[PDB]
Amino acid sequence: SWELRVFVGEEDPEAESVTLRVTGESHIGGVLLKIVEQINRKQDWSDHAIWWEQKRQWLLQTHWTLDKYGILADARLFFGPQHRPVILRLPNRRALRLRASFSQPLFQAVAAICRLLSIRHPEELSLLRAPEELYDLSYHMLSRPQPPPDPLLLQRLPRPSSLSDKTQLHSRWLDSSRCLMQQGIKAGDALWLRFKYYSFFDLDPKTDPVRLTQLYEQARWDLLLEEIDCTEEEMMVFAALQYHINKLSQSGGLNPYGLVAPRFQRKFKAKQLTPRILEAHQNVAQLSLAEAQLRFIQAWQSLPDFGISYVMVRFKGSRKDEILGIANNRLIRIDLAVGDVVKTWRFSNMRQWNVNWDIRQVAIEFDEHINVAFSCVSASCRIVHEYIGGYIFLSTRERELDEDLFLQLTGG
Question: CATH number for the domain including 79?
Fold first, then answer.
């Protein structure tokens, strides 16, 4: 019988603490009852658990022993609630304060968030961490498009201006097989909810109003902030559709600069832009709001660079960094000196894919005994591995989510 210390502080975790006598064969469920025993508050403890800082793990095996886990006198154990608030930023740029489990694997936390938001098929979405006011939950906030922004916001926000600039986003995806607590997220932190895989199952205008609106907002903001490229002409029909969607949204000034990317703002004066947008609007004036949102997504899905997440890598043997493009059906190799795609590998040709952890390298085996290998530069090997396996798992959906197949394919 020896002493084991467990911190129990809320605001400051190590302020308050409790000490108890433990037996080695003492069980987690017993340790937890000994803990609650020496805390004066009466309250619901059903959500509290113990976090083992050294091993970066929640002690969820209620009936395992301290010896089964490997816990000794030197173990910063932290007693606290599993559900904590996070600031969730949506594709439409609005934020909600939500309670999320910090112990569930991330993909279950995403499904819980999406259920509350009425967004179907949560496997297509995931969470981004914060790069290194807010609203309340309502149907109209989630389902109705937001007004066009101040064009000054678009000009002053940072925007990609190179292929390598566009890899920055995908370094921030969280690991969907691990919990928030294991990935350095704390209560109150901001997390971004984003569509991650450009493979949208059964996206129909009627059933999915919040899903439709948020995907439309993701595409819209990618175009306004130059995350993806389009021509002048394409920008005019994108602007006409946004103007159409906004006008329908107000009936239950135009400012053309609120509807086009800054590179077009810096080139045309408002007086030249408005006629071009209104002309392009003649082609879509007959559309319902949902139809217009779907037309916007369809045109976005038609862009040359659509559906590709860019990651800087270094292929085995190569002597310079190159861009890996992850699409929903293929991998793309882009040579920065050439400036163009120099190779593609089909997902339909892919046999196995693994991360060789000694070297921190992705290895992939293809048909006809083609082997590809690379180290990751702008994102982690976990992120690339999960992205590829995630796409394979989504192509499975033509036949309820086989969670076991997902974790297998994504390395969890």
Answer: 3.10.20.90
